[PDB]
């Protein structure tokens, strides 16, 4: 997790200001009043968890399926924007009519030189993909994907009444995707919708051509409708010359929505009553995270009012459509009440009783089991591979994670984190300007870390507010998405609490008063200073969502919070291949234990191995790291290094002996935290394996030199706890979770303190 | 006994395949004129594909499933005997499966008193270039 | 094989027949294979027509024993 | 008589591990969890010891004993 | 040998099992020694498990003729202690022709430096018959 | 059928299924029927025809020669 001050926050982390999204640049705080009331449809969203595997290649074909696939592909960062995927796709099937030969040759597969026409059909369907790999020689395909696409028309079932088999399909694993959207994500949505406008007609045409085909004869003679097949689809491809223009339409519905927001009356911003109605927008005004997307792209690209729309006809064609009313996005529009709620609340009491520890937190049970893949490549001799799930490290390590599936529950974490509770004297005097604002989400880490980037750098970029901006455009991307997902998540969750919101320019640089933020209100909070407001008027009135967050009364989490976890043995006997890599290849790696007693080096040196007790190596497998399982413990890692370096900065600053007592107790209580945690980690059964076996090895080392064979001399007290960590080290790296540069940290922190048991055991 | 009849059928089938692939291969060798070559080489494929399919019916449906069974036994036990069963995923897919299956139906066919043995090696010789791919299994 | 016929275009036709096309007799095979003589050798013997005089009362004439049928 | 490790018995007397009675080897040592219970009860008895002569003898012929003999 | 147990101190225990300890069957010896086959060779054959394929109808199978009984041994007194049962068919990835043995929850002491299946929780469940005895009273 | 259920009680002959899949594989009932069997065949099972050292008994007596320390 992670925390801020309650009074200050901009001096703690600029990223959660509305102002930073507004690009206010640290200076003046937003406050400007003169307000317009709102309401909630609790706003459009995504899913949150959707780990599943589509079938393709079975010849059913449905654009909504592929839309997810390309969308996920960009979410894999396989190229970049979906829009790029699409323009490059059209660049691909600019091999459109310039290649009649696609028909002439696939029909040649139908056998062929079909001027020798007849009810020729016999058998063969399901792998034109290879003869179409010859079509890849005809249609080179640096991407696997569209090459894997085009097969379908000839072989969805065509000719639907024979050809014939498949008895086989294909594969891909969509994972859960991004939680909340943005400019690029949206244009990717509507772009995916132009593709939606593509493929469905592309199926329907053939769907009727087949009706007009088997005139009988039987399937009738070729070099015709077959030789047709998709020429009409090419015309359908030419029906696709003009959907819209994604950035323009998105910017359009955007800024017109903003005009619907802004106080600014005049003709530049006068949403016509001629069209203030007309469906959709009437609830679409209510969406609010979508509104965050507004202020976001308003932040990046100014406003750039192309206003492709008129005032009414047609201010209709442009908002004919948008992403939620697309199914093309994994993301989906959202009903009324729950918003996206699933976080409880508690708050510190000094019997006064203003909070000093805000408690806002997670809600999430991590995977109970994970399974290794055996990369049995054989077909194609390239990317094509089979994984064949089988038990291995799997079952046993999983059962060992079950206790971790208890003792590292988030509820227990925050509950202990809440137990930090009493601090700076007593009791009853803990208050002093700011107060800690602890928080964190399952999502931001589960995704940004899934991209393999280490979220904490972005987190710190938020903490300083200002972007490091030295990153690769890829990392530039992960940073951006990190930002608006943090921010917006906090926004619309905070919104999920407080019922009412009002629009607020800002002013400052105006830059034409279109720039704007929000201010909120609640009353129940006790007459105490809190944030800039205090509470002022018996009511909040704050720009800043965190402020409304702090005042909220304690509650409970709602969502099923489960990791759901994938399975695939079915699809595995089916596979085939897909962009899978990221796992990656060789399931684990050794870590080397060491210790000294009687002033002698020993170095236990253990692998990897199954370690569990059946050799050897194994080999080969690789298991996926759960995003979640490492993400959560990384939240805590962020806490560890947080209290470490920051309160060490306190060790540097306030040299007051009482403040000395504070840094003492706090750093040494995170110390007792990881202490007792690894402590319970050592009792784990694999931990038991590491204990007995590594101890067996170094006892064998005792037998090395003949005089230090004088029985065990390690065991007294300190050594046991001292090696107890080693169990937490196997549980660390190559348990499939922690990423090293970690035990590193833990080592230094375990050096920071006396540790000991500290008692128990 | 030494059952008759069927021998003539399967032989005719065998030799006629010989006529088949000879003709088609010559056709692609020159005829000439692309529109036809892919046709025949396309044709070629499903011909083999056709036989592929029917060969499973020869076997893994009574009683050559016993054959693949025992083959799996002997091979994995051989893995253990040479030591590692480590690499032995080989109860799995296609290539090995086409291998063992076609071998199986062909094998019970060997136990069938008709078609010798040369026909077997020639047959797998046929499928081997053609493609094999599928993945029809399953 | 009938299906093979369309392979390979295009039409000849005078320059080279025509074809046997026709025989593939189950009967002729079984008649000889019953004695496990292997008919297939007898086949070419009808290609050239003349018997290759494998002088043995259960060799040569048996070939001819088929040819009649 | 002989000996073998308990944890490593599959790496040891691998045939004796009952999982071997099935073709199982795998990354996994059989098992998992599932369902239907009933102690399988009443085993066929003790053929050990109980050695004795029998008489074929009479032509009155008992097939039964002769079977046992077969 | 029981007396040997105190040799040699001191306590391990996790680093290296555990031990067979258990078998020394008069029965398995006599069953084979009656044919003067010498059981002792069959013994190692169950060490590696796989038969060494001494191909002869009164050689190889006779080894296996014992091995069956050998399995047949433990299961029976794996009945008493405990009537715990089932287990599943264990299809794995290949191949579901059926594959279901038996399981034994028994009941246990709360420590498990014995059995890879840590499943101490109340008791072992358990995948293999011997562990029951391993957790059994004398 | 007033007997095969006694076999439901004779489930001691377990392991037979084990090697059955192992010695062989799929266990198709092939002469299955559905009336049969039932009907006669399980009735016609050996132990009830009692040849052999096939032997028959309750539980532990066979175990009643197991040492334990």
Residue numbers in the entry:
A (entry chain B): 1 to 761
B (entry chain A): 624 to 761
C (entry chain A): 417 to 485
D (entry chain A): 1 to 70
E (entry chain A): 417 to 554
F (entry chain A): 278 to 346
Verbatim from the authors:
Here, we present a general computational method termed ‘localized reconstruction' for solving structures of symmetry-mismatched parts of macromolecular complexes. The method allows symmetry-mismatched and/or flexible subunits to be treated as isolated single particles separate from the rest of the complex, facilitating their classification, refinement and reconstruction. To demonstrate how localized reconstruction can be used to address symmetry-mismatched components, we focused on the RNA-dependent RNA polymerase of bacteriophage φ6.
